[PDB]
């Protein structure tokens, strides 16, 4: 019935207690062939799956949030949903420590009655203790931590960068739908900038945390259970985060490469393919976790502007308030670090545009000729398998003379286009001399076929547009 006793006997799989699971698929279309106005679009999916297991937990609203080092919460789904349940009970003092530079042997402080406000003031002290020892400068470099990834889905990206999906959706304004319908290509970068961090020395036994007036039944009452094991916030990073979004409408498979080239500023950044992509991309940057609020957003077609934002935020002032960016918790029982577990599937995709064209035949040869034009019309069933529907031209196997012109329109889904023209030397078609034989002609907007010359010296040509 006691704190150490009740806790020391909790049955739970620490590697499953905290889990944020999402979407798992099996019923997906490997291939989608559809028309879109005058175009013919071809989507080609490929189920992909990611599995994250972070130990460092993100904090959403620094003002609404009062999490601190030493705090107590339950390892439940609320926590997983970025809104943990804090256990408020009269407790024992605890030692806290900041990692600002040049402060060894002076960085620790003891907080008698840990509470958000109580601990904060301690930290405040520590910082001032620093600002005192070091009066010349009050600004230091932030410790940035870079992360990057393409956006395929909410749960995907959310776990990839270990950030709450809503946050991006709100601040970066991510159009998860267009993304889904493959109408947009998006990449997100995250610059975690830590100024300093604070830890709370781990206790030998749970009891060391709580006062004596406290009993396990209280804890088991507040919510402590096998479904809500108790834990303590061991570390808290203070600083801010810069989120950068790289979006485009281009469907090229080079986008990613292009984005990276732009970000890193590599020499291959001028690949004309990239330049066009860049010309069709939009970049967004924002800085959260601070007290800046919404007033620091930037949308440009000029990345140099995004580069500045990052550069300008490479420092933090020891004379300004620093808010919680993230934290790592620890199970009371074994003092092991907690780690929210996430597993989810998603679908990488690609969509190739097509557009109808036509065959332009032109006969100006001093002989009689017969054409043979055929092609296939691609289709895709429910299982995403190819389905070729053969098509042929009317004017096939029909004589044609001095200057015959005609246009043969083709659907955007025309494949294996074959254009043949034979002269009339001797018996039947299947016995004549060839003026032109082309196979698998690339469906373009204009396939200009044309024969000419004499019976002995025929001539032909095919151009494109």
UniProtKB/Swiss-Prot annotation:
Homooligomeric pore complex of 35 to 50 subunits; when inserted in the host membrane. This is Perfringolysin O. The chain crosses the membrane at residues 154-167, 174-183, 252-261, 269-281. A cholesterol-dependent toxin that causes cytolysis by forming pores in cholesterol containing host membranes. After binding to target membranes, the protein assembles into a pre-pore complex. A conformation change leads to insertion in the host membrane and formation of an oligomeric pore complex. Cholesterol is required for binding to host cell membranes, membrane insertion and pore formation; cholesterol binding is mediated by a Thr-Leu pair in the C-terminus. Can be reversibly inactivated by oxidation. It is found in: Secreted; Host cell membrane. GO terms for molecular function: cholesterol binding; toxin activity. SUPFAM superfamilies: Perfringolysin. The keyword Secreted applies. A motif (Conserved undecapeptide) lies at residues 423-433. Its main location: secreted. Keywords: Cytolysis, Hemolysis, Host cell membrane, Host membrane, Lipid-binding, Membrane, Secreted, Signal, Toxin, Transmembrane, Transmembrane beta strand, Virulence. The lineage of its organism: Bacteria, Bacillati, Bacillota, Clostridia, Eubacteriales. One of its GO terms (cellular component) is membrane. The keyword Repeat does not apply. Belongs to the cholesterol-dependent cytolysin family. It is a multi-pass membrane protein. A motif (Cholesterol binding) lies at residues 455-456. GO terms for biological process: killing of cells of another organism.
